[PDB]
Amino acid sequence: YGFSVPGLYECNRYPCIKEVECYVSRPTEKTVFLVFMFAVSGICVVLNLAELNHL
Amino acid sequence: YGFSVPGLYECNRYPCIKEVECYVSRPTEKTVFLVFMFAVSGICVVLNLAELNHL
Known part of the structure; x- marks a missing residue:
């Protein structure tokens, strides 16, 4: 998973x-x-x- | 215009x-x-x- 969840995905x-662009839900939380x-x-x-x- | 009308456009x-794909109307006619x-x-x-x- 790395250290962050990006707000956009390709x-x-x-x-x-x-290629299409998709958007994530609650990336910051x-x-x-x-x-x-x-x-x-x-x-x-x-x-x-x-x-x-x-020991 | 060339010699033909393609049915797809990028x-x-x-x-x-x-980049997106679009579709033409009545290309053959x-x-x-x-x-x-x-x-x-x-x-x-x-x-x-x-x-x-x-002359």
């Missing part, structure tokens, strides 16, 4: 003719959610590594 | 986004009309040239 899949989940997962990883090192 | 003019008018004009040209040469 699509060239059948049956669409050549989804970006915030993505970043927050990444941060929480990183914290979990750090704590797990600390425990494993302690 | 248009990339503002405000159209990128227009092609026939174009060719017929060209032939008649050619006959007229030939006759006029013959007259001028005769």
Whole structure:
């Protein structure tokens, strides 16, 4: 997923003719959610590594 | 105008986004009309040239 959800998409899949432009819903909220989940997962990883090192 | 009227057109003019496809009305009748008018004009040209040469 990367780190952001763009507000525009360029699509060239059948049956669409050549290239078409499509518009996403609530890109900013989804970006915030993505970043927050990444941060929480990183914290979990750090704590797990600390425990494993302690052992 | 050339010698034919194609049935499809590719248009990339503002405000159209990128490139779009458009469809023409009665391409075949227009092609026939174009060719017929060209032939008649050619006959007229030939006759006029013959007259001028005769002079």
